[PDB]
Design an enzyme around this catalytic site. Structure first.
Site, PDB file in Angstrom:
ATOM      1  N   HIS A   1       5.804  -9.802   5.527  1.00  0.00           N
ATOM      2  CA  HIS A   1       5.747  -8.519   4.870  1.00  0.00           C
ATOM      3  C   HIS A   1       5.487  -7.425   5.920  1.00  0.00           C
ATOM      4  O   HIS A   1       6.163  -6.412   5.934  1.00  0.00           O
ATOM      5  CB  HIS A   1       4.603  -8.570   3.882  1.00  0.00           C
ATOM      6  CG  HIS A   1       4.466  -7.355   3.030  1.00  0.00           C
ATOM      7  ND1 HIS A   1       4.731  -7.368   1.677  1.00  0.00           N
ATOM      8  CD2 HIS A   1       4.007  -6.111   3.312  1.00  0.00           C
ATOM      9  CE1 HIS A   1       4.475  -6.176   1.166  1.00  0.00           C
ATOM     10  NE2 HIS A   1       4.010  -5.399   2.132  1.00  0.00           N
TER      11      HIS A   1
ATOM     12  N   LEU B   1       0.824  -1.212   0.000  1.00  0.00           N
ATOM     13  CA  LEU B   1       0.000   0.000   0.000  1.00  0.00           C
ATOM     14  C   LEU B   1       0.874   1.286   0.000  1.00  0.00           C
ATOM     15  O   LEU B   1       0.422   2.359  -0.399  1.00  0.00           O
ATOM     16  CB  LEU B   1      -0.927  -0.002   1.192  1.00  0.00           C
ATOM     17  CG  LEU B   1      -2.010  -1.075   1.142  1.00  0.00           C
ATOM     18  CD1 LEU B   1      -2.903  -0.950   2.340  1.00  0.00           C
ATOM     19  CD2 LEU B   1      -2.828  -0.948  -0.116  1.00  0.00           C
TER      20      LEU B   1
END
Ligand SMILES: CCCC[C@H](CN(O)C=O)C(=O)N[C@H](C(=O)N(C)C)C(C)(C)C
Ligand code: NI
Length: 164
Positions: free
Chosen positions: A132, A91
């Site tokens: 992540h 994002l």
């Protein structure tokens, strides 16, 4: 509330989060906003760092129907194994995707939204996602695993988007 998500090359993204000192209402609101933000942004995970909150907090939902909430406060990687990789996206790095090496399986300990400790062993998409997110908490990004050439390119694409 929906929080603003930072994008590269904001140096705030390279900050190292502190551990949550106590799971309280303030924390739970943060958790709630992060879920709202994640679903709003259409991501399957989110780390506090990404929204300028430097505390070890992560929210996840890797579910197909997007109806499985997972909160990891002060997570600890206990064991890990195997190697794997998919084309991940972030994002904070709009529209860029790339395969990065990850453990295939992981086992972690964390606190839930109620500050209760739990253990979880994951694999598949869930384990990669967990990895992540934990990297975010230490100011690391997926592009960091890449070549400088590739890194420069991603950076350029991102700045042009944010320009438009
Ligand atoms: C491996 C988990 C990737 C987490 C990020 C969000 N983010 O940056 C969190 O820090 C995400 O949702 N990526 C998607 C994705 O890469 N998938 C493979 C589902 C999109 C790029 C589709 C949003
Ligand atoms: Ni990310």
């Amino acid at each position: 509330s929906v929080l603003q998500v930072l994008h590269i090359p904001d140096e705030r993204l390279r900050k190292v989060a502190k551990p949550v000192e106590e799971v309280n209402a303030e924390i739970q609101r943060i958790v709630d906003d992060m879920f709202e933000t994640m679903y709003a942004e259409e991501g399957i995970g989110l780390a506090a760092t990404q929204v300028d909150i430097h505390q070890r907090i992560i929210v996840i939902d890797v579910s197909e129907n997007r109806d499985e909430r997972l909160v990891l406060i002060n997570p600890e990687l206990l064991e890990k194994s195997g190697e794997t990789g998919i084309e991940e996206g972030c994002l904070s790095i709009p529209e860029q995707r790339a395969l990065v090496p990850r453990a295939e399986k992981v086992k972690i300990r964390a606190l839930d939204r109620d500050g209760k400790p739990f253990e979880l062993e994951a694999d598949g998409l869930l384990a990669i996602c967990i990895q992540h997110e934990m990297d975010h908490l230490v100011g690391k990004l997926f592009m960091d695993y890449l070549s400088p050439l590739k890194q420069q390119r991603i950076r350029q694409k991102v700045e042009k988007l944010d320009r438009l």
